[PDB]
Scaffold this active site. Structure first.
Site, short mmCIF file in Angstrom:
data_model
loop_
_atom_site.label_atom_id
_atom_site.label_comp_id
_atom_site.label_asym_id
_atom_site.label_seq_id
_atom_site.Cartn_x
_atom_site.Cartn_y
_atom_site.Cartn_z
N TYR A 505 -29.85 -5.26 28.63
CA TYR A 505 -29.51 -6.67 28.44
C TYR A 505 -30.64 -7.41 29.22
O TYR A 505 -31.58 -7.87 28.59
CB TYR A 505 -28.06 -6.98 28.88
CG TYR A 505 -27.69 -8.45 29.06
CD1 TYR A 505 -28.53 -9.46 28.62
CD2 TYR A 505 -26.48 -8.81 29.64
CE1 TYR A 505 -28.24 -10.80 28.86
CE2 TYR A 505 -26.14 -10.15 29.80
CZ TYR A 505 -27.02 -11.14 29.41
OH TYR A 505 -26.71 -12.46 29.64
N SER A 588 -28.84 -8.80 21.29
CA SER A 588 -29.14 -10.18 21.71
C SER A 588 -30.35 -10.28 22.66
O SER A 588 -31.48 -10.14 22.18
CB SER A 588 -27.89 -10.83 22.29
OG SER A 588 -27.58 -11.93 21.47
N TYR A 589 -30.15 -10.52 23.98
CA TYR A 589 -31.26 -10.52 24.91
C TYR A 589 -31.76 -9.07 25.04
O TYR A 589 -32.97 -8.85 25.04
CB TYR A 589 -30.88 -11.11 26.28
CG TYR A 589 -32.07 -11.62 27.06
CD1 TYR A 589 -32.94 -10.75 27.69
CD2 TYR A 589 -32.33 -12.98 27.16
CE1 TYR A 589 -34.06 -11.21 28.38
CE2 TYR A 589 -33.42 -13.46 27.88
CZ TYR A 589 -34.31 -12.57 28.45
OH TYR A 589 -35.41 -13.03 29.13
N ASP A 666 -25.35 -15.17 11.43
CA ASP A 666 -25.39 -15.31 12.87
C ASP A 666 -25.76 -16.76 13.18
O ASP A 666 -26.87 -17.19 12.90
CB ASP A 666 -26.39 -14.33 13.47
CG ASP A 666 -26.24 -14.11 14.96
OD1 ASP A 666 -25.83 -15.06 15.66
OD2 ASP A 666 -26.56 -13.00 15.44
N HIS A 698 -22.33 -13.22 15.24
CA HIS A 698 -23.20 -12.58 16.22
C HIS A 698 -22.68 -11.22 16.73
O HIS A 698 -23.46 -10.30 16.93
CB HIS A 698 -23.46 -13.54 17.38
CG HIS A 698 -24.44 -13.03 18.39
ND1 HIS A 698 -25.76 -12.79 18.04
CD2 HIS A 698 -24.28 -12.74 19.69
CE1 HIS A 698 -26.34 -12.35 19.14
NE2 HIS A 698 -25.48 -12.30 20.16
C1 LIG Z 1 -29.33 -14.26 22.55
C2 LIG Z 1 -28.89 -14.30 23.94
C3 LIG Z 1 -28.53 -14.34 25.05
C4 LIG Z 1 -28.08 -14.39 26.45
N1 LIG Z 1 -26.69 -13.96 26.67
C5 LIG Z 1 -25.68 -14.76 27.14
N2 LIG Z 1 -25.85 -16.13 27.34
C6 LIG Z 1 -24.85 -16.81 28.17
C7 LIG Z 1 -23.63 -17.22 27.34
C8 LIG Z 1 -24.05 -18.04 26.13
C9 LIG Z 1 -25.09 -17.30 25.31
N3 LIG Z 1 -25.53 -18.14 24.16
C10 LIG Z 1 -26.28 -16.94 26.20
N4 LIG Z 1 -24.54 -14.12 27.34
C11 LIG Z 1 -24.83 -12.84 26.98
C12 LIG Z 1 -26.13 -12.69 26.57
C13 LIG Z 1 -26.66 -11.43 26.15
O1 LIG Z 1 -27.80 -11.22 25.77
N5 LIG Z 1 -25.71 -10.38 26.22
C14 LIG Z 1 -26.16 -9.04 25.80
C15 LIG Z 1 -25.22 -8.29 24.89
N6 LIG Z 1 -24.57 -9.01 23.96
C16 LIG Z 1 -23.74 -8.36 23.15
C17 LIG Z 1 -23.02 -9.17 22.11
C18 LIG Z 1 -23.54 -6.95 23.26
C19 LIG Z 1 -22.67 -6.19 22.44
C20 LIG Z 1 -22.55 -4.85 22.62
C21 LIG Z 1 -23.27 -4.20 23.61
C22 LIG Z 1 -24.12 -4.90 24.43
C23 LIG Z 1 -24.27 -6.29 24.27
N7 LIG Z 1 -25.13 -6.97 25.10
C24 LIG Z 1 -24.38 -10.51 26.65
O2 LIG Z 1 -23.62 -9.57 26.68
N8 LIG Z 1 -23.96 -11.78 27.02
C25 LIG Z 1 -22.57 -11.95 27.45
#
Ligand SMILES: CC#CCn1c(N2CCC[C@@H](N)C2)nc2c1c(=O)n(Cc1nc(C)c3ccccc3n1)c(=O)n2C
Ligand SMILES: *[C@@H]1O[C@H](CO)[C@@H](O[C@@H]2O[C@H](CO)[C@@H](O[C@@H]3O[C@H](CO)[C@@H](O)[C@H](O)[C@@H]3O)[C@H](O)[C@H]2NC(C)=O)[C@H](O)[C@H]1NC(C)=O
Ligand SMILES: CC#CCn1c(N2CCC[C@@H](N)C2)nc2c1c(=O)n(Cc1nc(C)c3ccccc3n1)c(=O)n2C
Ligand SMILES: *[C@@H]1O[C@H](CO)[C@@H](O[C@@H]2O[C@H](CO)[C@@H](O)[C@H](O)[C@H]2NC(C)=O)[C@H](O)[C@H]1NC(C)=O
Ligand SMILES: *[C@@H]1O[C@H](CO)[C@@H](O[C@@H]2O[C@H](CO)[C@@H](O)[C@H](O)[C@H]2NC(C)=O)[C@H](O)[C@H]1NC(C)=O
Ligand SMILES: *[C@@H]1O[C@H](CO)[C@@H](O[C@@H]2O[C@H](CO)[C@@H](O)[C@H](O)[C@H]2NC(C)=O)[C@H](O)[C@H]1NC(C)=O
Ligand SMILES: *[C@@H]1O[C@H](CO)[C@@H](O)[C@H](O)[C@H]1NC(C)=O
Ligand SMILES: *[C@@H]1O[C@H](CO)[C@@H](O)[C@H](O)[C@H]1NC(C)=O
Ligand SMILES: *[C@@H]1O[C@H](CO)[C@@H](O)[C@H](O)[C@H]1NC(C)=O
Ligand SMILES: *[C@@H]1O[C@H](CO)[C@@H](O)[C@H](O)[C@H]1NC(C)=O
Lengths: 721, 719
Positions: A505, A588-589, A666, A698
């Site tokens: 992440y 995502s990130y 998304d 998403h």
């Molecule tokens: C693009 C982007 C981005 C940034 N981001 C944010 N912010 C703050 C809140 C508002 C948001 N707009 C931006 N919250 C996040 C992430 C992010 O990358 N991941 C990784 C992730 N995400 C998901 C959905 C996952 C799912 C499964 C496994 C690992 C994962 N890892 C997260 O988990 N969360 C909770």
């Protein structure tokens, strides 16, 4: 029975899921909870007896999925027809039930569908949002009074946030707040008229697809405008809604509304955040009787700025006010750079530091007459644990008590708390490392009264399962500490070579190495497919001071990538990792970071997976991007916005196996991000595997989640054999 | 010496050249030479001279030219901006050849959607912003013919999306009369047609939506009005509407094509929305009212009780010198599309050609000869041979010009006739290396070789190309023609992996005697695979019993016939039953998906590139032609039963590769988006690939990526 490894089916069905008990407090010694046959039981802690207040036959009569008891207990709202919209927003039909009469409230029926609804903090007053407009009902069966009139879909928003405020600013579905006694109602007005829109196809089940337009400001684009108003609920027609004065230094340029906190019925606290998110203002406004409006003096403006990075973390911390309603407690960085609790009476200059040290205070749960409750890292110096602390206020020799440190030491080191009215009683929810447990404690002695949810069903189910061993350790390279969580296969041998998968992440203000229990995909990968899994927290991650957090300021896609590489090199030299079989996955990130790490040109990673990744900071929301990157202008940080893209590293994906996944609908990280990566890889003549998910959000919820985790497992099993 | 490589196919190393003379007179033609000079060649007095220098073309970045019939001017086309399959917008510059300078004055606007000279003189007709303009002389201010042209709504002089693709197969919808006295034009109205919207990412911060009025099966169709204007005095009476026949106007209809007979006589073809009936209406000009009279006596109906009208198009008539009678290709009593001669009525039509073979196209009807292309020679339906038959002479003549011109090398021809057929050019496309020759139009003798392709002949000397064989199978009274591509040094005792390349759409033919060095030639040459192309029911040029077999039953017999063929190829002994695959694009993507999900276990893996998933998502003009209407009263039952999504649970034990371009305006990305959604719901694993901002054909480096990606999928599948 015989011991067996986890299966992908167990993870997808959520067989090893846990239950959590958060009491729906109604008084200082009473709480509501939904029973097994879907009844609403009112448990009184002092008297020790419980009774059904809303039967399963009353809920089934209107297909109700949720409820809301009015403070005066005369009525209960029945929520049915839940229709999800964005992350928090949803639309539903609401039925008021007269508990005293024993019949539904018939008369001036509520419209359908309602975007948000809530009771006043006392009595039976109602506030709701319908067609982006706010309406007020003095009594459930009374005709509503319309407060706002400009609400138009996808343009003017009243009482509810627009797309960008819901997602990146408020993190909630509402934008209205009742005063402590229901004398005033505060609300926000969002204007998305000139914001450019994001359009995407939604195929659905009709002959032609439909276009979905969402006003979304990408980095540097026109942002929504906000106007906060407060209306007298007792006599709204007298003077009407009054706008809250924006501070002179906030209004000078573009600004964001951070949050609203009611102090008393004649005093409200508003937080503002300049578009350049390194300076926030805490303005305290008092109600005046000669003008019937809200006065905001310069003397009550408290500036909180960050010269090293951004103001706060994911949000600008909210203040928790004292009984005197003039002073408050707030979490913000100290001299050394650690986010600690401070006590502000008059001015910020004279703030008194309440907590200190090389650890951070995460949240203030309650500020009582003599106690202050908060969560922190402090215990045994582990940044991934959360414990509840209790410190005295006002007493000559001070006290400091860790409530949860040794409550259940081996099993529980990641807690959250929920306080009853005036902290008479409270509930602690343990999330790990062991099986989660919810307990209920006395607010005066901290003693455990009863176990709310012990999770004995999950404890017995996991008896015959070979769960992997999870270890939280740290690496110390070049004055930078990297905390990591390593998931080891069952019957792990330090003399063998195990394939390695990195789950990443790495976004700013985040933390992925936490003492939280979870039976997820990577648990199956270690249990059945004999892989070593690792999660590394480097620069840019939160709760270890500002030197670590602000290291990625204006330099995204650089240090978080380097820190994953530094960690893999260290894990290799441990002797139990096969250097030929290493992979990295993210969402995502994490999709942006794994793509950049895979195209680093180091030869460490054999294959990689990017699910709904960000490809360029020009495609993400202004609210998130500009907080950690700055403006994409020649005079500011345009140079790094161009250098920090996945598309610029296209030619580096030539000898690695890349798997690119993304949902077509998304709304958060648009499909455009993956469409651009794919186009760059085509132009660079680079082969890769891809997957799209039609009409999916998403998070790819539903049968798409099954398909995704199966498809990724096939890709890894090919890459590792 | 060496096998073909994927790079050789992608780079087009073994490409062939073709010579189609740009005729200007009966004995002259233009051609842009080596140094990009436009040269004029005269066949009679064997002399050539440069008429437009490379310096003149480079001065305005010109990519194309157009000499006026009177030769006083030449248009210079530059700034080519492709739009759809045929349509494009460009900047035009008129060059005064007599003065030696560009035409100054009432300059042409930019960009122009279509432009052309009159058949005689210096008259100009052009489409700008969906409107028709007229220039009597190049430097004169234009006379505006139409005024209602609005983007994506009203079209004048150019077709709309659906007419360009499925009906006219041309970028223009205007026709000058034989001497430029009248200009006929089309008026398309897409106002109430539902639109198809798709994202185009491009290179900007936000993507843009592209909207195209596209009528899917059963949706509202565009309306068409045809008009004719006097180009000598267009202000006198103005544009006159051509009367639509009473039986055509009774319900929804299509304008098929316009054919000018004389300056005072025009022939229009109409098609009913239920495409089993077409009308050939002949209209004459009336001085008394300065309008076009269309009598009931000059309406010639052509209907099909078994299936649809014609093939891909309703055949156009070729008129006699008398301008009253004509020659047209259509089905005979036995069901074979042959040339007929119509004077007065369709009832009294005289059959010119007959037999168990079809007449494909009529190239030229002269004063004493008739030139046409057919299957006839040696009974091979995949061959094209050009014949010359006499008309008017008491004892008739019939000769096959091409049959033995170069028998081993050439059996697939096309012909380009000069003004009045004084000379004509023969273009041979295969089976051997393509050759273009120039023949005397009176004696059929070869005068010179236009393009022999000696560069490609020498390049292929060290290349061990696969052996291609065109044979037939005879199963249950159904003949299946097939083309089999065998690896070099092929052994009938060994087992070889098999790949089936499929299309199988109605009115098509994929087993032709055409030379091609394509992807499947590499797969056989380097990767030792056997390749096969089978033509079953629904394919054209073998009578109407084979063609109309798939009428209202799409996705059924074409799939069964590929299965029947694979079972036959397996029992030949040289095919590994464990390693078989099927690939296809577009219609072939629909057929390969259905064949892969047939549940027979014959195919191990399959690839579908830009496939059709349901007939609910495709163009009405194409879909309702072979399947009818998707209504309860008509064929809704089969529209629902003929989808790829209904066969989702059958893709569980097969490897499926689904590819599709996101900006596909023809077969929309929706088709693959629905298949992927069904496979997810059915819990079936598959491999996928999307191509951002790419058209139906995936042109450019996207082609390179696709063919590479498909090669990996097959290499893995055949290991
Ligand atoms: C693009 C982007 C981005 C940034 N981001 C944010 N912010 C703050 C809140 C508002 C948001 N707009 C931006 N919250 C996040 C992430 C992010 O990358 N991941 C990784 C992730 N995400 C998901 C959905 C996952 C799912 C499964 C496994 C690992 C994962 N890892 C997260 O988990 N969360 C909770
Ligand atoms: C991609 O394909 C094209 C053909 O479509 C290749 O171009 C041709 O390359 C060959 C070999 O390099 C050239 O052949 C030689 O030409 C000279 C005269 O220029 C002649 O003296 C030699 O005997 C020989 O025939 C040829 O000129 C060149 N161009 C054309 C117009 O055919 C191209 O090389 C291919 N790309 C790659 C990377 O192989
Ligand atoms: C859906 C559908 C469809 C029908 N269709 C049409 N018509 C007439 C003109 C108007 C059009 N709307 C409909 N022309 C076609 C096809 C078709 O399927 N293929 C197969 C094919 N296509 C492509 C692009 C191929 C590319 C590579 C290999 C094999 C291929 N095979 C063709 O080649 N051509 C030329
Ligand atoms: C999917 O997971 C649920 C639990 O989340 C399984 O349901 C449990 O099954 C056991 C069987 O002994 C019962 O004793 C539990 O009470 C059930 N719990 C719940 C919450 O219903 C379910 O069996 C799993 N599905 C499959 C196919 O195994
Ligand atoms: C193009 O088509 C549209 C729709 O078929 C025509 O507009 C209609 O015309 C009728 C008759 O004049 C009106 O009564 C309707 O109200 C119109 N409907 C709409 C949706 O506009 C339009 O006139 C046609 N234009 C041309 C030049 O043919
Ligand atoms: C052209 O095709 C149409 C198909 O719609 C044929 O129309 C059918 O005729 C029957 C006559 O009883 C009607 O009841 C149906 O409603 C029509 N459609 C179908 C398929 O049920 C029409 O007869 C055909 N015309 C020719 C000359 O073959
Ligand atoms: C909303 O913004 C638009 C465009 O900037 C402006 O014209 C309008 O006055 C605003 N409306 C309201 C109600 O704020
Ligand atoms: C906040 O950010 C701007 C732009 O980067 C910078 O110029 C300014 O000095 C910063 N302010 C503080 C107080 O750090
Ligand atoms: C661009 O980014 C790369 C890392 O991706 C870095 O090595 C380089 O120095 C940066 N600067 C310039 C000017 O390219
Ligand atoms: C233009 O044509 C002349 C004469 O054929 C020739 O000498 C010259 O090289 C040509 N220039 C180009 C750019 O082809």
């Amino acid at each position: 029975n015989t011991m067996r490894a986890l299966t992908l089916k167990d993870i997808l069905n959520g067989t090893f899921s846990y239950k959590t008990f958060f009491p729906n407090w109604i008084s200082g010694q009473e709480y509501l909870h939904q029973s097994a046959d879907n009844n609403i039981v009112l448990y009184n802690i002092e008297t020790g007896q419980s009774y059904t207040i809303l039967s399963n036959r009353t809920m089934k009569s209107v297909n109700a999925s949720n409820y809301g008891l009015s403070p005066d207990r005369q009525f209960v709202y029945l929520e049915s027809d839940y229709s999800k919209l964005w992350r928090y927003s949803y639309t539903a039909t609401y039925y008021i039930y007269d508990l005293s009469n024993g019949e539904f409230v018939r008369g001036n029926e509520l419209p359908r569908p309602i975007q948000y609804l809530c009771w006043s903090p006392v009595g039976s007053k109602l506030a709701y949002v319908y067609q982006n407009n706010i309406y007020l009902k003095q009594r459930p069966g009374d005709p509503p009074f319309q407060i706002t009139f400009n609400g138009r879909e996808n343009k003017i928003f009243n009482g509810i946030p627009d797309w960008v405020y819901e997602e990146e600013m408020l993190a909630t579905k509402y934008a209205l707040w009742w005063s402590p006694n229901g004398k005033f109602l505060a609300y926000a007005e969002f204007n998305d008229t000139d914001i450019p829109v994001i359009a995407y196809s939604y195929y659905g089940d009709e002959q032609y697809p439909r276009t979905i337009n969402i006003p979304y400001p990408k980095a540097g684009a026109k942002n929504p405008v906000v106007r906060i108003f407060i209306i007298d609920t007792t006599y709204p027609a007298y003077v009407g809604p009054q706008e809250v004065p924006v501070p002179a230094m906030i209004a000078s340029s573009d600004y964001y509304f951070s949050w609203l906190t009611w102090v008393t019925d004649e005093r409200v606290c508003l937080q503002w955040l300049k578009r350049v998110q390194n300076v926030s203002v805490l303005s305290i406004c008092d109600f005046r009787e000669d003008w019937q409006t809200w006065d905001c003096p310069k003397t009550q403006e408290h500036i909180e700025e960050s010269r090293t990075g951004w103001a706060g973390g994911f949000f600008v911390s909210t203040p928790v006010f004292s009984y005197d309603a003039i002073s408050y407690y707030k979490i913000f960085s100290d001299k050394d750079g650690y986010k600690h609790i401070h006590y502000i009476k008059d001015t910020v200059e004279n703030a008194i530091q309440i907590t200190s040290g090389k650890w951070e205070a995460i949240n203030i749960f309650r500020v009582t007459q003599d106690s202050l409750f908060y969560s922190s890292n402090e215990f045994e110096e582990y940044p991934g644990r959360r414990n509840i602390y209790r410190i005295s206020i006002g007493s000559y020799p001070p006290s400091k008590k860790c409530v949860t440190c040794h409550l259940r030491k081996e099993r529980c080191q990641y807690y959250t708390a929920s306080f009853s009215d005036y902290a008479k009683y409270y509930a602690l929810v343990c999330y790990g490392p062991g099986i989660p447990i919810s307990t209920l404690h006395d607010g005066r002695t901290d003693q455990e009264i009863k176990i709310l949810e012990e999770n004995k069903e999950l404890e017995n189910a996991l008896k015959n399962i070979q769960l992997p061993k999870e270890e939280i350790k740290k690496l110390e390279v070049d004055e930078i500490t990297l905390w990591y969580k390593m998931i080891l296969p069952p019957q792990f041998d330090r003399s063998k070579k195990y394939p390695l998968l990195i789950q990443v992440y790495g976004g700013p203000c985040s933390q992925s190495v936490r003492s939280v229990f979870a039976v997820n995909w990577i648990s199956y990968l270690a249990s059945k497919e004999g892989m070593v899994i690792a999660l590394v927290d480097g620069r840019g991650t939160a709760f270890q001071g500002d030197k670590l957090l602000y290291a990625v300021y204006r330099k995204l896609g650089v240090y978080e990538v380097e820190d994953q590489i530094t960690a893999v090199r260290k894990f290799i030299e441990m002797g139990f990792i096969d250097e030929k079989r290493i992979a990295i996955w993210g969402w995502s990130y994490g999709g942006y970071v794994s793509s950049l790490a895979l195209a680093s040109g180091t030869g460490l990673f054999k294959c990689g997976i990017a699910v709904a990744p960000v490809s360029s900071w020009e495609y993400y929301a202004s609210v998130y991007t500009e907080r950690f990157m700055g403006l994409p202008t020649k005079d500011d940080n345009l140079e790094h916005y161009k250098n920090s893209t996945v598309m610029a590293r296209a030619e580096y994906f030539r000898n690695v196996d890349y798997l690119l996944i993304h949902g077509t609908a998304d709304d958060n990280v648009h499909f455009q991000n993956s469409a651009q990566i794919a186009k760059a890889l085509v132009n660079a003549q680079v082969d890769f595997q891809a997957m799209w998910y039609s009409d999916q959000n998403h998070g790819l919820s539903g049968l798409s989640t099954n398909h995704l985790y199966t498809h990724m497992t096939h890709f890894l099993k090919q890459c590792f054999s």
